[PDB]
C-alpha cells in the first residue's frame, strides 16, 4: 500500500453532511466524523434542521462518529453562551481568540457532547462504529494523544489576543498563549478519561479565503493528491501552514505514523450557500479525489484503526501498538495473537501504553515519568511494570510524591 489515508470531517452533523456521506458511500470509503452536538439543538448557525438525519446516516452506513465537543468551544468566543452565540461568533470571526479558558469546563463539554447524542439517539451505544467516548479532536488544535510516547500539541493553535495574520502577532513556542496552555490541559484531561486525540497531516481547505465565495477555491482533486503525496512520511504536522495548524513536538519518524496521512476537512465546504458553490463545485472534487487516490495505490481507513485494533490470528512484532477495547497496548514480543493472549492489565505479552498520565496497571514506567494517583503527583524513580500491589501511595521507593 502506497499509504493509508484517514479522511476526516469536522463540525457536523449538518445538512451538508448527508451529501458528503452519500459521495463517500458511492466511492466505497469510510470517513471519521468529529461531531458537535449543538447542531442537533439547532443553535450551531448552520443549515442543520437535518442534523439528526445526518447523524443517523453516518451511523447506519458505517462511518466512525467521534467527539469534537458540544459547541466547538464557542462559549469561550462570546460573553454569555446562548442560542445566538454561533451567529455572534461568526460575525466577529474570533473563534481562535481565548478559545480555551477554564480547561476543566472546556474538557467537560466533550462529556456534554455525549449526553446530547444519547438523548437524541438512545441506541447510539449499540453501534460498533460509535467512538464518541474513545476518539476526540480539539477545536482549532493540531494536538495528538496517541500513546504514552506519541503526543503533540499545537503551541500556536489559539491566541490570547491577535490572530496569526494581524500585525504584531507573536508565537513564543516556549511561552505559549494562555489559551494554548489551557488546550494542553484539555488534551491531558481527555487522555485520562480514555480518549485518543488525533490532529492532521494536511487540511483540504480553500486556498484563497479572501474572495467572495471562498469555498470555490478548494484545492482541485489532482493537486490535493499531490499534497497527500508530499505529506507521506514527511512529518507534515510540523511543516504544515499556516502557523496555527502546526503540531509541535510531533515524534517525526515514529512507526505508528509511517505511511499514513490524516486529512482534515469540513462538510460545510461542500454546500451551496453562504461560503460559495461548495456542493456543485467541491462534491465532484471529493468524488474524483477518492477515485484517483485509490488508483494511485492509497487505501482509506478510519481513525479507530489508526492504532490497529487487536485481532485473533494477526501477527505482531515486538513494539507494535494495538488498541483493545479502547485501551492502547504495546507488544512485548513477536507473536501471533491467540484468543487467550488478548491484551489485559496483567498480560505478559502486552503493556498498557495509553497516552494517559494517571497511574495505570501494566504500564512500562521509566524513571522520570510522572503519574497522578488519588489526587497526588508522583515521580517514577525506578523503571518497572506497574501492578495492583505497587500503587504509588504505598511504594515509597518506586515513587516519590511531588508538589
Ligand atoms: Ca472513558
Ligand atoms: Mg489551542
Ligand atoms: Mg481509550
Ligand atoms: Zn473544528
Q: State the span(s) of the chain assigned CATH 2.10.10.90.
A: 315-401
Centre of ligand 2 to C-alpha 195, Å, is 17
Measured between alpha carbons, how far is residue 232 from residues 3, 4, 73, 298, 303 in Å? 7, 9, 31, 11, 17
The candidate with the shortest Cα–Cα distance to 150, out of 274, 76, 235, is 235
Residues near 164 by beta carbon (within 8 Å), at least 6 away in sequence? 156, 171, 242, 243, 244
Dist CA 359 CA 199 (whole Å): 25
> Whose grid coordinates read 479532536?
137
203 is in an annotated binding site: no
**Other C-beta atoms lying within 10 Å of the C-beta of residue 350:** 28
Pairing, β 327-331 against β 321-324: antiparallel
Give the contacts of 79 (CB within 8 A, at least 6 positions apart).
none
The annotation status of 63 as a binding-site residue, yes or no, is no
Q: How was this structure determined?
A: X-ray
* In contact, 20 and 62? CB cutoff 8 Å: no
Was domain 315-401 assigned CATH 2.10.10.90?
yes
Report which of 362, 150, 392 is spatially closest to residue 251, judged by C-alpha positions: 150
CA distance 136 to 198: 7
Ligand positioned closest to the Cα atom of 193: 1
Distance, in Å, from the CA atom of 364 to the CA atom of 115, rounded to the nearest integer, reads: 34
CB-CB neighbours of 177 under 10 Å: 24
Per-residue H/E/C for the chain: CCEEEEEEEECCCCHHHHHHHHHHHHCCCCCEEEECHHHCCCCCCCCCCCHHHHHHHHHHCCCEEEECCCCCCHHHCCCCCCCCHHHHHHHHCCCCECCCCCHHHHHHHHHHHHHHHHHHCCCHHHCCCECCCCEECCCCCCCEEEECCEEEECCCCCECCCCCCCCCCCCCCCCCCHHHHHHHHHHHHHHHCCCEECCCCEECCECCCCCCCHHHHECCHHHHHHHHHHHCCCCHHHHCCCHHHCCECCCCCCHHHCCEEEEEEEHHHHCEECCEEHHHHHHHHHHHHHHHHHHHCEEEECHHHCCCECCCCCEECCCCEEEECCEEEEECCCEECCHHHCCCCCCCCEEECCCCCECCCCEEECCCCEEEECCEEEEECCCEECCCCCCCCCCCCCEEECC
d(CA 294, CA 301): 12
Residue 314 C-alpha cell reads as: 494477526
Instruction: Write out the CATH class of domain 3-305.
Output: alpha beta
Where in the chain are all domains bearing CATH 3.20.20.370? 3-305
Q: How far apart are CA 188 and CA 203, in angstroms?
A: 24
Please give the distance, rounded to the nearest whole angstrom, from the Cα atom of residue 362 to the centre of ligand 3: 15
326 is in an annotated binding site: yes
Q: Does 48 appear as a known binding residue?
A: no
* 26 marked as binding residue: no
Q: Which ligand is nearest to the CA of 352?
A: 3
What Rg value do the Cα atoms of the chain yield, rounded? 21
Distances from the Cα of 79 to the Cαs of 39, 48, 63, 98, 101, in angstroms? 20, 24, 36, 11, 12
Resolution in A: 2.5
**Among candidate residues 68, 70, 72, 76, the one with its CA nearest the CA of residue 100:** 76
Amino acid at each position: 500500500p502506497k499509504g493509508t489515508i484517514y479522511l476526516t470531517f469536522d463540525d457536523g452533523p449538518i445538512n451538508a453532511s448527508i451529501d458528503v456521506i452519500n459521495v463517500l458511500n458511492e466511492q466505497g470509503v469510510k470517513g471519521t466524523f468529529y461531531f458537535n452536538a449543538w447542531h442537533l439543538d439547532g443553535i450551531g448557525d448552520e443549515n442543520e434542521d437535518r442534523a439528526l438525519e445526518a447523524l443517523k446516516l453516518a451511523l447506519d452506513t458505517g462511518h466512525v462518529v467521534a467527539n469534537h465537543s458540544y459547541a466547538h468551544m464557542v462559549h469561550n468566543c462570546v460573553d454569555e453562551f446562548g442560542p445566538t452565540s454561533g451567529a455572534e461568533c461568526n460575525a466577529t470571526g474570533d473563534h481562535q481568540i481565548n478559545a480555551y479558558q477554564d480547561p476543566v469546563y472546556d474538557a467537560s463539554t466533550f462529556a456534554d457532547n455525549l449526553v446530547v447524542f444519547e438523548r437524541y439517539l438512545p441506541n447510539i451505544n449499540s453501534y460498533p462504529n460509535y467512538f464518541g467516548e474513545e476518539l476526540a479532536r480539539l477545536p482549532y488544535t493540531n494536538g495528538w494523544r496517541i500513546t504514552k510516547d506519541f503526543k503533540a500539541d499545537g503551541l500556536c493553535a489559539t491566541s490570547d489576543d491577535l490572530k496569526p495574520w494581524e500585525p504584531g502577532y507573536v508565537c513564543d513556542l516556549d511561552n505559549p498563549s494562555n489559551s494554548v496552555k489551557a488546550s494542553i490541559e484539555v488534551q491531558n484531561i481527555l487522555a485520562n478519561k480514555g480518549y485518543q486525540t488525533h490532529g492532521w497531516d494536511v487540511d483540504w481547505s480553500p486556498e484563497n479565503w479572501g474572495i467572495p465565495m471562498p469555498a470555490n477555491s478548494l484545492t482541485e482533486a489532482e493537486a490535493f493528491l499531490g499534497y497527500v503525496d508530499a505529506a507521506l512520511n514527511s512529518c507534515a504536522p510540523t511543516t504544515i501552514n499556516p502557523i496555527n495548524s502546526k503540531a509541535h513536538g510531533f515524534p517525526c519518524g515514529t512507526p505508528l505514523h509511517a505511511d499514513k496521512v490524516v486529512v482534515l476537512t469540513h462538510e460545510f465546504l461542500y454546500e451551496d450557500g453562504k461560503r460559495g458553490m461548495g456542493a456543485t463545485q467541491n462534491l465532484p472534487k471529493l468524488a474524483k479525489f477518492l477515485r484517483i487516490a485509490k488508483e494511485a495505490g492509497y487505501v482509506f481507513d478510519t481513525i479507530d484503526n489508526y492504532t490497529p485494533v487487536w485481532q485473533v490470528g494477526n501477527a505482531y512484532a515486538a513494539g507494535d501498538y494495538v488498541t483493545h477495547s479502547g485501551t492502547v497496548y504495546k507488544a512485548v514480543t513477536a507473536h501471533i495473537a491467540q484468543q487467550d493472549w488478548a491484551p489485559s492489565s496483567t498480560s505478559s505479552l502486552w503493556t498498557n501504553a495509553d497516552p494517559a498520565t494517571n497511574w495505570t496497571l501494566n504500564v512500562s514506567y521509566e524513571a522520570g515519568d510522572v503519574v497522578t494517583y488519588q489526587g497526588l503527583r508522583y515521580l517514577v524513580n525506578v523503571p518497572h511494570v506497574s501492578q495492583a500491589d505497587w500503587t504509588p501511595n504505598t511504594q515509597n521507593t518506586l515513587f516519590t510524591a511531588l508538589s
